[PDB]
Design a protein around this nucleic acid. Structure first.
Lengths: 99, 108, 84, 96, 97, 78, 104, 92
DNA sequence: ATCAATATCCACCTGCAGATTCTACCAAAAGTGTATTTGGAAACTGCTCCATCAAAAGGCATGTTCAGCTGAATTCAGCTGAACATGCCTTTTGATGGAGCAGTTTCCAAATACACTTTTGGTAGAATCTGCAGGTGGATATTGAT
DNA sequence: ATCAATATCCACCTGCAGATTCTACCAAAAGTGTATTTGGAAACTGCTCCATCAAAAGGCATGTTCAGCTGAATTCAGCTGAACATGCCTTTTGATGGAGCAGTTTCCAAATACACTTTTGGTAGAATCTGCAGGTGGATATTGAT
């Protein structure tokens, strides 16, 4: 034909999949590099315990996952289903992260 | 002298009354600690451990596993109104999230 | 060693998409990925800054998982599972 | 060349076998459990510290811990934790 | 026969009340409500006047803040009229829900 | 008693918050929020009263309660 | 001869020391800690009082009231971050009206 | 009975604004400010010492607490003021 | 727009009062001076872990195409909420007495800190045990074209 | 209301990483005997609380009228999701040296712990003074309308 899922169907397949699992979703080595880059621009010659990087990734992903729930609510409140920077900014603002 | 009884056994508890007493004196909470304060606190801590492990073990059963992993802890916390409020600012490493899709997102 | 540059871009579009998925998000506009990188970077700066301050104050050169755990507690993002 | 770190794992594991005698716990989940106990310990003790201070009292008694528990825990969790703690204290003072 | 167009006095009131700091809930009804709610927790209580004033100040500051977040949620949905779903969205994002 | 918290008084609070137009169902929604707020704060305060073995809620009992709830108030003792 | 005059401070070093010892913060308290802490509280007090005196003058007023402490805090990025979970009684809010709500 | 930071707030007021007064409600606000920041600094320095298994809160704990608690450019100045008071104090 | 008219709002002064500021005097902290304790900085150093390296491989990232259906624009009409004048009631305000009651002051008996001297309970690993992660195959759906 | 394509189950299988149990000394509990408190349990103040009582007005409740805002209906350009090809770079296994934690000792500068002597800061009657709130009068803002 070839067969083809309608737009929206694989997206719901993926919500169900990643809401079922708990594994980290950002790749380890790239994230370790981001952390060492931010760290270095704050103090030089720093070393990291591996569990320290792992703790930061766990927290960073729990934060972003939690923010996208709030963002999704703001999109739906606007009668959309597409999250946009307006929504992240509105979520962030009400969260009191930055009013 | 007499044979030694642990203050936990005196208190009827699994959690360590003596250690909880030491952590209170060492934690700079007050000049003095009464004798009942570690007993009462070890009791509350063990009761809460018991309530979480109860619901976690159930989640492990529902998921056909016999070993509690962080997922099971997370499902136990998030599905209980009161643990979820007690821990609503806490992140459980490797816990993931509750399956929840807003209705309006489902195929129309 | 070797210069670290532009590593925020290793937070790829598919990784941000998966994170939106766990967050229950079905549709994502094309400007979301650069806003997410920005939000991540502020989050990491603030946590790494406090963690490294716990490090400096202990006269250590190694950032420990405890340093990060205390940094996160400061910020009201208490984390379980690294308290060792 | 030796160094040792305390934990609640022993007592978590005992209470585990009491509630689900068939069930194990992975060290990662035991990690979480250790964080939980230490967290709630600090919240109870910290609120108890403040209570004692507001009342110009230099001693944390079971009465402080109990008000702290009532301030910290919601609803049914507080009622049941207050029961367990009261019961344990009277059992301990009855020398029991 | 003089009449102001809808929204004009309202903006006027926004400017007036954003300028002042007086409490905007009347004092006695609020005291009634405080004592009624408090009566369900402990009986036969007395209140320092400053305790009632503290509660009313906390309570009006909370509500004013929440109306700001509510207003932002209404604007986000292309409206100028706050609605209960706006208060609900703000209350939820604030992590009080 | 909560109906004593009146529509025009709820208008005034909304106005200080910048609100131009108000739906007719906001007033009951507001009273419900205000009541949860007062229950949470007063419950904590009376718990400080009772701990102190008093019959009088003090301003400090409220200030301590507000601090527990993350709503720190300046001007009444801390 | 007080420790404040010695530290060159208006804030009471001796009181800040007595409050640290009796506050159950640590078993022991160094000698410079009440000096340091008292300097930090005086500086931040001066910062607020300065900005709030300004807010008084710009209101044709000579007596600082709560409203001027609120306008000083909320109009300063850093004091606002530091005091973002604090309610200043009788301070009110900053004038601010979302553009969308204006006429025409 | 019932001590306050009032006279010290008033002294600092006259230094920066010798023309200006302060209402008693405003003075209450300032008292609340000083106790709050005091407890935040003290609380954090307390944690810092416990984390590193010290029994003593020194100005090193106060300074790191200030760095951890104040937005930069208020922590910078606070760190300045605190360092300055400790040297002027030791030199005498 | 710059026509006539309603209300809003804005300056400039003005005088009694409610809060401020300033004077005047007594306990409880704050400062000294001795005489101890002790915490944790300084100095080898054992030994965990961290940074780095190599190398092979497949899981994924990247870019492209293509079109489904979403967001954004436009229109429109019913109807919700604003403005208003009207009229009455609940809030506010205020010396009056009375009383409940925080807050003090005087004890003392129960309870806590202390302090060496003995006993375990718990920790750190070796030793023994076993869920389940991950690989494979059919039910049994689920989806989307016709 | 059907096939076909594809994803989703779900149960059955097997040793490896990861538990659970088995030992073996120390730190840290428990015992016991003295030396300080603590903070209750009474008593009796002085505040500040509640409860009236009675005025007046400021404020709220009520009903009209319509302006304009919300939401429903319709279009459509093009954004974003699905699927594909291609091959890069993360992941995994496994060394290696050596940085820098962490552990023991050893011990002065700095801390607690007294016991006294001065000092200051909190009270409560005394002293001005800032701005509230109320006059006027003058433009400003709004809204109707040749």
């Amino acid at each position: 034909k070839p067969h083809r899922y309608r737009p929206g169907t694989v997206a719901l397949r993926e919500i169900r999949r990643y809401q079922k699992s708990t594994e980290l979703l950002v790749r380890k080595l790239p994230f370790q590099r981001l952390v060492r880059e931010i760290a270095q621009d704050f103090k030089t010659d720093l070393r990291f315990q591996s569990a320290a990087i792992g703790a930061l990734q766990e927290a960073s992903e729990a934060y972003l996952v939690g923010l996208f729930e709030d963002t999704n609510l703001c999109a739906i409140h606007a009668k959309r289903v597409t999250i946009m920077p307006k929504d992240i900014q509105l979520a962030h603002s009400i969260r009191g992260e930055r009013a | 002298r007499a044979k030694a009884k642990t203050r936990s056994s005196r208190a009827g508890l699994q959690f360590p009354v003596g250690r909880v007493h030491r952590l209170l004196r060492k934690g700079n909470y007050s000049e003095r600690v009464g004798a009942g304060a570690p007993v009462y606190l070890a009791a509350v801590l063990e009761y809460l451990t018991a309530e979480i492990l109860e619901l976690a073990g159930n989640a492990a059963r529902d998921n056909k596993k016999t070993r509690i992993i962080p997922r099971h802890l997370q499902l136990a916390i998030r599905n209980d109104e009161e643990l979820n409020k007690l821990l609503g600012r806490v992140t459980i490493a490797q816990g993931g999230v509750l399956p929840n899709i807003q209705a309006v997102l489902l195929p129309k | 060693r070797k210069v670290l540059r532009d590593n925020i871009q290793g937070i790829t579009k598919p990784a941000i998409r998966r994170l939106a998925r766990r967050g229950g998000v079905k549709r994502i506009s094309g400007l979301i990925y650069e806003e997410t990188r920005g939000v991540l970077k502020v989050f990491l700066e603030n946590v790494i800054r406090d963690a490294v301050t716990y490090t400096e104050h202990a006269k250590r050169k190694t950032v420990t998982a405890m340093d990060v755990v205390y940094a996160l507690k400061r910020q009201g993002r208490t984390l379980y599972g690294f308290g060792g | 060349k030796r160094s040792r770190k305390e934990s609640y794992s022993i007592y978590v594991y005992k209470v585990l076998k009491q509630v689900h005698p068939d069930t194990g716990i992975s060290s990662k989940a035991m990690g979480i459990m250790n964080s939980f106990v230490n967290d709630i310990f600090e919240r109870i003790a910290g609120e108890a510290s403040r209570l004692a201070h507001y009342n110009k009292r230099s001693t944390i008694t079971s009465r402080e811990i109990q008000t702290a528990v009532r301030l910290l825990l919601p609803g049914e969790l507080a009622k049941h934790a207050v029961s367990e703690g009261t019961k344990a204290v009277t059992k301990y003072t009855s020398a029991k």
